Amino acid sequence: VEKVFFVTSPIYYVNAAPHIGHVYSTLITDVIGRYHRVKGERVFALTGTDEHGQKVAEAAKQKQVSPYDFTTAVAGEFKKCFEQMDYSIDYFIRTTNEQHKAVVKELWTKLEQKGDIYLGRYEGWYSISDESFLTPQNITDGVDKDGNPCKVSLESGHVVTWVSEENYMFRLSAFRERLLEWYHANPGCIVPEFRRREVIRAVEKGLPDLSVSRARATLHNWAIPVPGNPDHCVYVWLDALTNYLTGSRLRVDESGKEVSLVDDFNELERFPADVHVIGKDILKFHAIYWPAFLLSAGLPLPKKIVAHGWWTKVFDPVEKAEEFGYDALKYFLLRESGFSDDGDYSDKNMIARLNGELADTLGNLVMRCTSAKINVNGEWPSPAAYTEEDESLIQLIKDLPGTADHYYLIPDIQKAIIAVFDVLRAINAYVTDMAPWKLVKTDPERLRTVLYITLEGVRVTTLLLSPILPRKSVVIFDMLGVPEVHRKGIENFEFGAVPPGTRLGPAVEGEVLFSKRST
Ligand code: MET
């Protein structure tokens, strides 16, 4: 089905200021978004803020400000952070938005009409910080900020409290068999694979019904009212998860403001998400509750949920981007960690990767193929006959787009970067063997062949890196003199798409692409 590629970040709680966790989650969302745009697809990338609930209201009360003022302020800090980080997200949703609330009520009403919401009790543990219901097996003894002996979440270590409320209850237990069918029928729907296995084990163990409302006093009245029962408010997670549906139904203008909410999601061709990006801490909500809601409502299910190794919720990313470069930082975060949390975030290692990979591997190579010394005519030369060594490198360059594409689609952005850099290392090796600096005098016919391959290797690697390094890719292409039309589209993944005779861009006397730093 030709649709709009719909990729989401989670919507972030506004109890605290934006931080690296949020920036990472939204970076992954953004990169996926960018890759599909580079592929020539229609894209709708979504991010935003999760503004209702007990936690946000209590954080606003601690600041001695009204929940409305506080959410608006913090949402502003989030918006500004994401502008600073130079993302290309299509819309920023807020759960306080009136159109969002409409969609929630509409969804609630469907679930109710379907017979899947009933009036019952929740008597059990709850983590206000996680906004999560927990069984007694998921808690242990612990300490709080008054040093007192309390109970805490095994998940997150935050304080838990016993709740005993009459609550609207969603019949999650009825969806165990259908969820298991879904997981088994769609074995790539949860990535990475060990998290897919974790979800399945949990659903196999059995599912309780889920409390989807709370008494309004418990939430300090800071929530969406239940349709036809103002004594109750809608659970912040049903509220929150529904942002993805709301987002898929908003017409947005050129400045990024929502102008209209369509009735039927099919009108905008976004729903359901192709990729939900989340942290590992909210997997249950996205892989169990969310599909169960959609199943109840007869709505289509997402294609993939990708759960990274970090938590959704010092090291300030805007500070480090100003210190080391924006694209460089993004590169580092995406390169340094896969789905394991174990990975070394340190000035030592940021500099190791900056110098080793960005400067010495990529940057070095860009300068070699464009310098006046080696590229004497300042153009893409026409190649002479290819040796078997030439062919071996060409093969790597030809194969790379297909390999990188599979990685980007999993999605595993670390592996995609690695694949591209393997080819970059190969090109450096090739350039070392051929010694094109010697060939300017010794054999100019041979240099044409060597230079051309080098240029084309640089173009193709750069094109596949352009979702990771959106600014630097533009600079590289300007130096190489790659016309705008050749900077995107699957057609331009092909070897040879830029014809010989293309002139390089002008240089400037101070130009480095990535400046190395002191160790
Ligand atoms: C529907 S995604 C909700 C994410 C949640 N607000 C968090 O900050 O973890």
Short mmCIF file of C-alpha atoms and ligand atoms in Angstrom, two decimals:
data_model
loop_
_atom_site.label_atom_id
_atom_site.label_comp_id
_atom_site.label_asym_id
_atom_site.label_seq_id
_atom_site.Cartn_x
_atom_site.Cartn_y
_atom_site.Cartn_z
CA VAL A 1 0.00 0.00 0.00
CA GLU A 2 1.28 3.38 -0.99
CA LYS A 3 0.75 5.49 2.04
CA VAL A 4 2.47 8.26 3.99
CA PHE A 5 5.31 6.78 6.03
CA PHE A 6 4.29 7.49 9.62
CA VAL A 7 7.07 7.47 12.24
CA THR A 8 6.61 8.60 15.87
CA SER A 9 8.58 9.38 18.97
CA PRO A 10 6.97 8.89 22.33
CA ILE A 11 5.28 12.01 23.79
CA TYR A 12 7.29 13.18 26.80
CA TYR A 13 6.11 14.05 30.30
CA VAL A 14 6.43 17.73 31.10
CA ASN A 15 7.22 17.37 34.81
CA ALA A 16 10.86 18.14 34.06
CA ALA A 17 12.88 19.96 31.50
CA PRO A 18 14.00 18.27 28.26
CA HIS A 19 17.12 16.16 28.54
CA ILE A 20 19.21 13.65 26.56
CA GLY A 21 16.69 10.77 26.83
CA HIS A 22 14.08 12.78 24.95
CA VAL A 23 16.59 14.14 22.46
CA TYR A 24 17.75 10.56 21.69
CA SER A 25 14.25 9.14 21.23
CA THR A 26 13.30 12.05 18.94
CA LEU A 27 16.63 11.82 17.06
CA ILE A 28 15.88 8.20 16.16
CA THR A 29 12.41 9.22 15.05
CA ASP A 30 13.92 12.05 13.00
CA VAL A 31 16.61 9.88 11.33
CA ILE A 32 14.07 7.27 10.24
CA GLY A 33 11.93 10.12 8.98
CA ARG A 34 14.86 11.57 7.03
CA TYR A 35 15.89 8.20 5.51
CA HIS A 36 12.41 7.66 4.05
CA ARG A 37 12.38 11.23 2.69
CA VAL A 38 15.82 10.59 1.05
CA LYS A 39 14.26 7.43 -0.43
CA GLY A 40 11.64 9.76 -2.05
CA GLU A 41 8.67 8.69 0.10
CA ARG A 42 5.99 10.86 1.73
CA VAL A 43 6.72 11.11 5.44
CA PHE A 44 4.91 12.27 8.56
CA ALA A 45 7.20 12.31 11.61
CA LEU A 46 5.55 13.06 14.96
CA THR A 47 6.82 14.09 18.40
CA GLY A 48 5.33 15.95 21.40
CA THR A 49 4.40 16.32 25.04
CA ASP A 50 2.29 14.32 27.48
CA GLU A 51 0.74 16.94 29.70
CA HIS A 52 -2.06 15.46 31.86
CA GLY A 53 -1.90 13.25 34.95
CA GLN A 54 -1.12 13.10 38.64
CA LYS A 55 2.63 13.48 38.13
CA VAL A 56 2.49 16.61 36.01
CA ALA A 57 -0.02 18.24 38.35
CA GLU A 58 2.13 17.39 41.38
CA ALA A 59 5.23 18.79 39.61
CA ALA A 60 3.28 21.99 38.85
CA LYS A 61 2.16 22.19 42.51
CA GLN A 62 5.80 21.82 43.67
CA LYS A 63 6.70 24.81 41.47
CA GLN A 64 3.66 26.73 42.90
CA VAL A 65 2.23 27.39 39.41
CA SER A 66 -1.08 26.35 37.74
CA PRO A 67 -0.91 23.09 35.75
CA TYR A 68 -1.86 25.00 32.54
CA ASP A 69 0.89 27.60 32.85
CA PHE A 70 3.43 24.95 33.79
CA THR A 71 2.62 22.60 30.88
CA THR A 72 2.65 25.47 28.36
CA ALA A 73 6.03 26.64 29.67
CA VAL A 74 7.68 23.21 29.59
CA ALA A 75 6.17 22.33 26.21
CA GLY A 76 7.89 25.55 25.05
CA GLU A 77 11.21 24.35 26.41
CA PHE A 78 10.73 21.04 24.55
CA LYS A 79 9.82 22.78 21.27
CA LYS A 80 12.82 25.07 21.51
CA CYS A 81 15.16 22.15 22.33
CA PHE A 82 14.02 20.30 19.19
CA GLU A 83 14.48 23.42 17.05
CA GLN A 84 17.97 23.78 18.54
CA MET A 85 18.78 20.13 17.74
CA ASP A 86 17.88 20.78 14.06
CA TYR A 87 15.35 17.99 13.64
CA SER A 88 12.91 17.83 10.77
CA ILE A 89 9.77 16.63 12.61
CA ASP A 90 6.52 17.39 10.80
CA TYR A 91 4.33 18.06 13.86
CA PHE A 92 4.64 18.68 17.62
CA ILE A 93 1.47 17.36 19.35
CA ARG A 94 0.33 18.35 22.86
CA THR A 95 -2.25 16.32 24.77
CA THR A 96 -3.88 19.56 26.06
CA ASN A 97 -4.86 20.27 22.42
CA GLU A 98 -8.64 20.36 22.04
CA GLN A 99 -8.57 18.17 18.87
CA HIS A 100 -6.59 15.55 20.77
CA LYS A 101 -9.20 15.49 23.54
CA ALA A 102 -11.93 15.00 20.92
CA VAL A 103 -10.11 11.98 19.49
CA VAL A 104 -9.70 10.52 22.99
CA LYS A 105 -13.44 10.86 23.78
CA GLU A 106 -14.26 9.41 20.37
CA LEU A 107 -11.94 6.44 20.99
CA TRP A 108 -13.21 5.93 24.54
CA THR A 109 -16.77 5.86 23.27
CA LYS A 110 -15.88 3.17 20.66
CA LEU A 111 -14.32 0.94 23.31
CA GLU A 112 -17.40 1.45 25.51
CA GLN A 113 -19.89 0.69 22.67
CA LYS A 114 -17.87 -2.44 21.79
CA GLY A 115 -18.49 -3.76 25.36
CA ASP A 116 -14.79 -3.54 26.24
CA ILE A 117 -15.03 -0.89 29.03
CA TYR A 118 -16.91 -1.76 32.36
CA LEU A 119 -17.22 -0.21 35.85
CA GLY A 120 -15.14 -2.07 38.44
CA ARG A 121 -12.31 -1.54 40.99
CA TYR A 122 -8.56 -1.30 40.94
CA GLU A 123 -7.08 -2.35 44.29
CA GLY A 124 -3.31 -2.59 43.92
CA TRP A 125 0.04 -0.86 43.52
CA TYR A 126 0.69 2.16 41.29
CA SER A 127 3.85 4.12 40.41
CA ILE A 128 2.81 7.76 39.98
CA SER A 129 6.17 8.54 38.37
CA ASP A 130 5.77 5.81 35.73
CA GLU A 131 1.96 6.27 35.63
CA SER A 132 2.03 2.46 35.72
CA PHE A 133 -0.14 -0.22 37.41
CA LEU A 134 2.04 -2.93 39.01
CA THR A 135 1.31 -6.36 40.51
CA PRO A 136 2.93 -7.22 43.91
CA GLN A 137 5.67 -9.27 42.16
CA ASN A 138 6.90 -6.01 40.50
CA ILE A 139 7.65 -4.21 43.80
CA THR A 140 10.33 -4.48 46.54
CA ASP A 141 11.45 -2.55 49.64
CA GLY A 142 13.31 0.72 49.21
CA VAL A 143 13.99 4.32 50.20
CA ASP A 144 12.61 7.77 49.24
CA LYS A 145 13.89 11.38 49.47
CA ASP A 146 12.92 11.53 53.18
CA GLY A 147 15.06 8.38 53.74
CA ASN A 148 11.97 6.44 54.87
CA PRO A 149 11.28 2.72 54.41
CA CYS A 150 8.76 2.57 51.56
CA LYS A 151 7.97 0.28 48.62
CA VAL A 152 9.43 0.84 45.13
CA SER A 153 9.00 -0.37 41.54
CA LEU A 154 11.27 -3.21 40.35
CA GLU A 155 10.98 -1.68 36.82
CA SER A 156 12.17 1.82 37.73
CA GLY A 157 12.94 2.19 41.45
CA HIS A 158 10.34 5.00 41.84
CA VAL A 159 7.98 5.12 44.82
CA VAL A 160 4.79 3.05 44.62
CA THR A 161 1.53 3.57 46.52
CA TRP A 162 -1.51 1.41 47.12
CA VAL A 163 -4.64 2.63 45.26
CA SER A 164 -8.22 1.56 46.02
CA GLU A 165 -10.58 3.19 43.54
CA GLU A 166 -13.72 2.29 41.69
CA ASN A 167 -12.45 2.72 38.09
CA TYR A 168 -13.60 2.12 34.52
CA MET A 169 -11.86 -1.09 33.44
CA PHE A 170 -10.76 -2.08 29.93
CA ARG A 171 -11.15 -5.80 29.21
CA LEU A 172 -7.50 -6.44 28.37
CA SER A 173 -7.81 -10.11 29.42
CA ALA A 174 -10.10 -10.70 26.39
CA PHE A 175 -7.24 -9.71 24.00
CA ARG A 176 -4.55 -12.22 25.12
CA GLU A 177 -5.18 -14.72 22.30
CA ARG A 178 -5.45 -12.00 19.59
CA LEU A 179 -2.22 -10.28 20.76
CA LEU A 180 -0.36 -13.60 20.71
CA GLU A 181 -1.72 -14.21 17.16
CA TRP A 182 -0.47 -10.78 16.17
CA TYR A 183 3.03 -11.28 17.67
CA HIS A 184 3.47 -14.71 16.01
CA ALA A 185 1.98 -13.65 12.65
CA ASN A 186 4.25 -10.54 12.50
CA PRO A 187 7.60 -11.62 13.88
CA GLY A 188 9.28 -8.29 13.02
CA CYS A 189 6.60 -6.14 14.71
CA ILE A 190 8.73 -5.67 17.87
CA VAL A 191 12.42 -4.84 17.60
CA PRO A 192 14.86 -5.79 18.92
CA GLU A 193 14.05 -9.47 18.94
CA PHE A 194 14.81 -10.11 22.65
CA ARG A 195 12.18 -7.47 23.54
CA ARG A 196 9.69 -9.19 21.26
CA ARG A 197 10.39 -12.40 23.21
CA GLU A 198 9.94 -10.53 26.55
CA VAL A 199 6.52 -9.19 25.51
CA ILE A 200 5.32 -12.60 24.36
CA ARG A 201 6.46 -14.32 27.59
CA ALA A 202 4.47 -11.70 29.57
CA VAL A 203 1.28 -12.04 27.52
CA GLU A 204 1.63 -15.85 27.66
CA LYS A 205 1.65 -15.57 31.49
CA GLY A 206 -1.84 -13.97 31.34
CA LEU A 207 -3.34 -10.48 31.28
CA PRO A 208 -5.40 -8.64 33.88
CA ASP A 209 -8.07 -6.12 32.88
CA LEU A 210 -6.65 -2.62 32.85
CA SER A 211 -7.93 0.36 34.76
CA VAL A 212 -8.56 3.14 32.23
CA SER A 213 -10.10 5.79 34.52
CA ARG A 214 -9.30 7.47 37.80
CA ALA A 215 -11.37 9.45 40.28
CA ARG A 216 -10.88 13.15 39.42
CA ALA A 217 -9.60 14.21 42.88
CA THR A 218 -6.69 11.73 42.65
CA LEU A 219 -5.48 13.44 39.44
CA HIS A 220 -5.93 16.94 40.92
CA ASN A 221 -8.55 17.35 38.11
CA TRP A 222 -5.78 17.58 35.50
CA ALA A 223 -7.03 15.15 32.85
CA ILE A 224 -9.63 14.43 30.17
CA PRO A 225 -13.13 13.79 31.60
CA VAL A 226 -14.73 10.43 30.88
CA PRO A 227 -17.55 10.87 28.33
CA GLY A 228 -20.83 10.86 30.27
CA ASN A 229 -19.18 10.67 33.71
CA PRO A 230 -17.41 13.83 34.91
CA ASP A 231 -16.55 12.20 38.30
CA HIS A 232 -13.95 10.15 36.43
CA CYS A 233 -10.98 11.18 34.29
CA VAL A 234 -9.33 9.19 31.47
CA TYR A 235 -6.06 7.32 32.39
CA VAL A 236 -3.14 9.40 31.19
CA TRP A 237 -1.80 6.44 29.12
CA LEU A 238 -4.99 5.93 27.06
CA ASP A 239 -4.92 9.71 26.69
CA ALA A 240 -1.20 9.58 25.78
CA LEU A 241 -1.17 6.56 23.44
CA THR A 242 -4.02 8.16 21.53
CA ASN A 243 -1.70 11.02 20.38
CA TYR A 244 -0.59 8.72 17.55
CA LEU A 245 -4.20 8.53 16.29
CA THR A 246 -4.79 12.26 16.75
CA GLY A 247 -1.55 13.03 14.92
CA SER A 248 -2.56 10.86 11.99
CA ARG A 249 -5.76 12.95 11.65
CA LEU A 250 -4.37 16.54 11.81
CA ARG A 251 -3.99 18.66 8.67
CA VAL A 252 -0.98 20.86 9.34
CA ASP A 253 0.07 24.15 7.65
CA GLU A 254 3.51 25.34 6.44
CA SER A 255 4.42 26.90 9.83
CA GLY A 256 3.60 23.57 11.60
CA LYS A 257 0.31 24.56 13.31
CA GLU A 258 -2.69 22.18 13.28
CA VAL A 259 -5.52 23.68 11.21
CA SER A 260 -8.11 20.89 11.03
CA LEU A 261 -8.99 17.44 12.41
CA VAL A 262 -10.34 15.03 9.79
CA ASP A 263 -13.07 12.48 10.74
CA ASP A 264 -11.61 9.46 8.94
CA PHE A 265 -7.89 8.69 9.43
CA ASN A 266 -7.74 7.20 5.89
CA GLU A 267 -8.16 10.71 4.46
CA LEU A 268 -4.52 11.58 5.40
CA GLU A 269 -3.06 8.06 4.76
CA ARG A 270 -0.85 8.08 7.91
CA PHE A 271 -2.50 5.64 10.34
CA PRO A 272 -1.28 3.22 11.51
CA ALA A 273 2.34 4.00 12.30
CA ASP A 274 5.02 2.27 10.32
CA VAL A 275 7.44 2.79 13.24
CA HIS A 276 6.74 3.70 16.86
CA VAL A 277 10.11 4.68 18.38
CA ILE A 278 10.09 4.19 22.18
CA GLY A 279 12.44 3.62 25.08
CA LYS A 280 12.48 0.18 26.74
CA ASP A 281 10.68 1.54 29.79
CA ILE A 282 7.31 1.97 27.94
CA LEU A 283 7.26 -1.27 25.96
CA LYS A 284 4.27 -2.80 27.75
CA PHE A 285 2.07 0.22 26.98
CA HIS A 286 2.93 0.15 23.24
CA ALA A 287 3.17 -3.61 22.62
CA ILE A 288 0.27 -4.81 24.85
CA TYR A 289 -2.24 -2.04 25.78
CA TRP A 290 -2.10 0.01 22.56
CA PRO A 291 -2.74 -2.90 20.16
CA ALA A 292 -5.48 -4.19 22.51
CA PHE A 293 -7.22 -0.78 22.29
CA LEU A 294 -6.88 -0.72 18.50
CA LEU A 295 -8.19 -4.29 18.30
CA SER A 296 -11.22 -3.36 20.41
CA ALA A 297 -11.90 -0.32 18.21
CA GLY A 298 -11.41 -2.23 14.93
CA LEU A 299 -8.48 0.08 14.06
CA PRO A 300 -5.36 -1.12 12.19
CA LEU A 301 -2.25 -2.04 14.17
CA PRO A 302 1.20 -0.49 13.81
CA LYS A 303 3.79 -2.30 11.67
CA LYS A 304 6.81 -1.96 13.98
CA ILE A 305 7.58 -0.88 17.53
CA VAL A 306 11.30 -0.21 18.07
CA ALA A 307 12.48 -0.10 21.69
CA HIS A 308 15.93 1.35 22.29
CA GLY A 309 18.22 0.55 25.21
CA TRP A 310 18.08 3.92 26.94
CA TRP A 311 15.33 5.12 29.33
CA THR A 312 12.71 7.61 28.13
CA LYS A 313 12.99 9.29 31.61
CA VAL A 314 25.28 15.44 33.72
CA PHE A 315 25.21 15.67 29.94
CA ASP A 316 23.36 18.46 28.15
CA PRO A 317 23.06 17.73 24.38
CA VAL A 318 22.78 21.38 23.32
CA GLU A 319 25.99 22.13 25.27
CA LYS A 320 27.86 19.20 23.69
CA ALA A 321 26.55 20.00 20.17
CA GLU A 322 27.99 23.53 20.56
CA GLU A 323 31.30 22.02 21.84
CA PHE A 324 31.77 19.20 19.27
CA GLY A 325 29.27 19.93 16.40
CA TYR A 326 25.59 19.04 15.89
CA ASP A 327 25.85 16.32 13.25
CA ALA A 328 28.87 14.92 15.12
CA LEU A 329 26.91 14.52 18.34
CA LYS A 330 23.99 12.89 16.50
CA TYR A 331 26.48 10.59 14.79
CA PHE A 332 28.03 9.71 18.14
CA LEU A 333 24.75 8.86 19.88
CA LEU A 334 23.54 6.74 16.97
CA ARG A 335 26.91 5.04 16.38
CA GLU A 336 27.88 4.44 20.02
CA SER A 337 24.78 2.51 21.10
CA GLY A 338 22.60 -0.19 19.72
CA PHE A 339 19.76 -1.81 21.64
CA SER A 340 22.11 -2.58 24.51
CA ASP A 341 22.38 0.35 27.00
CA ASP A 342 26.14 -0.59 27.53
CA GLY A 343 28.09 2.00 25.54
CA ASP A 344 30.66 4.61 26.49
CA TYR A 345 29.43 8.23 26.48
CA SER A 346 32.50 10.29 27.41
CA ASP A 347 34.53 13.19 26.05
CA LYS A 348 37.36 10.69 25.48
CA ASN A 349 35.19 8.50 23.24
CA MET A 350 33.30 11.35 21.48
CA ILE A 351 36.71 12.68 20.46
CA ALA A 352 37.95 9.18 19.53
CA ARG A 353 34.99 8.80 17.11
CA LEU A 354 35.05 12.40 15.92
CA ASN A 355 38.74 12.14 14.97
CA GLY A 356 38.93 8.46 14.03
CA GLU A 357 35.74 8.17 11.94
CA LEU A 358 34.38 11.62 11.04
CA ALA A 359 37.73 13.39 10.42
CA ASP A 360 40.26 10.64 9.55
CA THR A 361 37.92 8.32 7.60
CA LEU A 362 35.21 10.50 6.02
CA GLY A 363 36.62 14.05 6.17
CA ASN A 364 40.11 13.02 5.01
CA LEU A 365 38.61 11.18 2.07
CA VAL A 366 36.44 14.15 1.01
CA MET A 367 39.51 16.42 0.95
CA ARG A 368 41.69 13.92 -1.02
CA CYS A 369 39.19 13.54 -3.87
CA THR A 370 38.54 17.30 -4.13
CA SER A 371 42.00 18.88 -3.53
CA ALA A 372 43.66 20.91 -6.31
CA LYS A 373 46.80 18.81 -5.83
CA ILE A 374 45.06 15.50 -6.82
CA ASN A 375 41.88 16.65 -8.65
CA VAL A 376 43.72 19.10 -10.95
CA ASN A 377 40.78 20.03 -13.19
CA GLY A 378 38.30 20.40 -10.28
CA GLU A 379 35.81 18.00 -11.87
CA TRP A 380 34.51 14.45 -12.04
CA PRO A 381 36.80 12.76 -14.53
CA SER A 382 35.69 10.11 -16.99
CA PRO A 383 37.05 6.71 -15.90
CA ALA A 384 39.43 4.55 -17.99
CA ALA A 385 39.29 0.73 -17.92
CA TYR A 386 38.66 -0.90 -14.54
CA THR A 387 41.14 -3.31 -12.91
CA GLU A 388 39.94 -6.26 -10.76
CA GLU A 389 40.89 -4.17 -7.70
CA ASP A 390 38.75 -1.28 -9.00
CA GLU A 391 35.87 -3.73 -9.57
CA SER A 392 36.12 -5.09 -5.99
CA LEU A 393 35.62 -1.62 -4.51
CA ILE A 394 32.91 -0.77 -7.05
CA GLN A 395 31.06 -3.89 -5.98
CA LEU A 396 31.12 -2.74 -2.35
CA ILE A 397 29.77 0.67 -3.38
CA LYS A 398 27.04 -0.93 -5.51
CA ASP A 399 25.97 -3.37 -2.77
CA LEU A 400 25.95 -0.74 0.02
CA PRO A 401 22.52 0.85 -0.64
CA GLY A 402 20.71 -2.49 -0.44
CA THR A 403 22.54 -3.42 2.75
CA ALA A 404 22.06 -0.01 4.41
CA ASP A 405 18.38 -0.01 3.33
CA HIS A 406 17.69 -3.30 5.15
CA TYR A 407 19.39 -1.89 8.27
CA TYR A 408 17.42 1.38 8.14
CA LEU A 409 14.19 -0.63 7.78
CA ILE A 410 14.69 -3.02 10.73
CA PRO A 411 15.31 -0.38 12.02
CA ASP A 412 18.92 -0.57 13.30
CA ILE A 413 20.60 2.74 12.62
CA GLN A 414 23.89 1.70 14.27
CA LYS A 415 24.29 -1.18 11.82
CA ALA A 416 23.48 1.14 8.90
CA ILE A 417 26.22 3.56 9.99
CA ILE A 418 28.68 0.68 10.43
CA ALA A 419 27.89 -0.68 6.96
CA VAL A 420 28.57 2.72 5.38
CA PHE A 421 31.80 3.17 7.31
CA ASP A 422 33.06 -0.29 6.26
CA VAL A 423 32.81 1.00 2.68
CA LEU A 424 34.45 4.29 3.65
CA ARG A 425 37.39 2.39 5.21
CA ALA A 426 37.65 0.29 2.02
CA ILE A 427 37.81 3.45 -0.13
CA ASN A 428 40.62 4.85 2.07
CA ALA A 429 42.50 1.55 1.72
CA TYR A 430 42.00 1.75 -2.06
CA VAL A 431 43.25 5.36 -2.16
CA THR A 432 46.32 4.40 -0.09
CA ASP A 433 47.12 1.52 -2.53
CA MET A 434 46.61 3.61 -5.69
CA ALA A 435 48.42 6.68 -4.36
CA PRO A 436 46.62 9.19 -6.66
CA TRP A 437 48.99 11.97 -5.52
CA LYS A 438 51.83 10.07 -7.33
CA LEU A 439 49.59 9.35 -10.35
CA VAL A 440 49.13 13.07 -11.27
CA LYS A 441 52.64 12.95 -12.82
CA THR A 442 53.17 9.18 -13.35
CA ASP A 443 49.93 8.11 -15.06
CA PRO A 444 47.06 10.59 -15.59
CA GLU A 445 44.82 8.09 -17.52
CA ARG A 446 44.92 5.80 -14.45
CA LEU A 447 44.15 8.67 -12.04
CA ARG A 448 40.93 9.40 -13.94
CA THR A 449 39.72 5.89 -13.04
CA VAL A 450 40.90 6.11 -9.40
CA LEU A 451 39.56 9.60 -8.76
CA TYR A 452 36.17 8.84 -10.33
CA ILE A 453 35.63 5.74 -8.19
CA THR A 454 36.72 7.65 -5.09
CA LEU A 455 34.29 10.50 -5.81
CA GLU A 456 31.44 8.13 -6.49
CA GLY A 457 32.18 6.13 -3.33
CA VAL A 458 32.15 9.36 -1.37
CA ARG A 459 28.84 10.43 -2.98
CA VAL A 460 27.03 7.17 -2.30
CA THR A 461 28.32 6.76 1.27
CA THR A 462 27.40 10.40 1.92
CA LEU A 463 23.88 10.00 0.49
CA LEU A 464 23.24 7.02 2.81
CA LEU A 465 24.72 8.97 5.74
CA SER A 466 22.59 12.09 5.06
CA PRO A 467 19.90 11.15 7.60
CA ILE A 468 22.70 11.01 10.27
CA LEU A 469 24.66 14.06 9.11
CA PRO A 470 22.03 16.26 7.42
CA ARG A 471 24.15 19.46 7.39
CA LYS A 472 27.57 17.97 6.68
CA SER A 473 26.13 15.84 3.86
CA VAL A 474 25.02 19.12 2.21
CA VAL A 475 28.52 20.55 2.59
CA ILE A 476 30.12 17.39 1.15
CA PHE A 477 27.74 17.45 -1.80
CA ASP A 478 28.50 21.17 -2.38
CA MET A 479 32.25 20.40 -2.40
CA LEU A 480 31.68 17.47 -4.79
CA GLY A 481 29.44 19.69 -6.94
CA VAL A 482 26.59 17.17 -6.81
CA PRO A 483 23.46 18.79 -8.32
CA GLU A 484 20.41 19.06 -5.97
CA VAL A 485 18.38 16.52 -8.00
CA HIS A 486 21.04 13.83 -7.38
CA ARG A 487 20.93 14.32 -3.55
CA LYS A 488 17.81 12.19 -3.03
CA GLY A 489 15.77 9.49 -4.63
CA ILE A 490 16.36 5.74 -4.93
CA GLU A 491 17.48 6.34 -8.52
CA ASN A 492 20.57 8.09 -7.11
CA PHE A 493 21.56 5.12 -4.92
CA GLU A 494 22.83 3.61 -8.22
CA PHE A 495 26.52 3.72 -9.06
CA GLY A 496 27.32 6.29 -11.78
CA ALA A 497 24.33 8.64 -11.33
CA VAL A 498 26.50 11.77 -11.45
CA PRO A 499 27.99 12.11 -14.93
CA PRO A 500 31.71 12.76 -15.64
CA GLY A 501 32.33 16.46 -16.39
CA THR A 502 30.40 17.72 -13.34
CA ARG A 503 32.41 20.60 -11.84
CA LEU A 504 33.29 20.58 -8.15
CA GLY A 505 32.10 23.34 -5.83
CA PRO A 506 34.33 26.26 -4.83
CA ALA A 507 36.65 25.73 -1.83
CA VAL A 508 37.43 28.37 0.83
CA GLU A 509 40.83 28.98 2.57
CA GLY A 510 39.60 28.03 6.11
CA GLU A 511 37.53 24.96 5.11
CA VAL A 512 37.78 21.87 7.25
CA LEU A 513 34.81 19.53 7.25
CA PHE A 514 35.38 18.08 10.72
CA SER A 515 38.19 19.71 12.74
CA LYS A 516 40.05 17.22 14.97
CA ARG A 517 40.31 17.91 18.73
CA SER A 518 42.97 17.45 21.42
CA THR A 519 42.94 13.96 23.00
C1 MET B 1 2.38 7.51 24.31
S1 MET B 1 4.12 7.63 24.71
C2 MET B 1 4.04 8.24 26.41
C3 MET B 1 5.41 8.44 27.03
C4 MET B 1 5.37 8.95 28.47
N1 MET B 1 4.69 10.24 28.54
C5 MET B 1 6.79 9.05 29.03
O1 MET B 1 7.25 10.21 29.25
O2 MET B 1 7.41 7.96 29.24
#
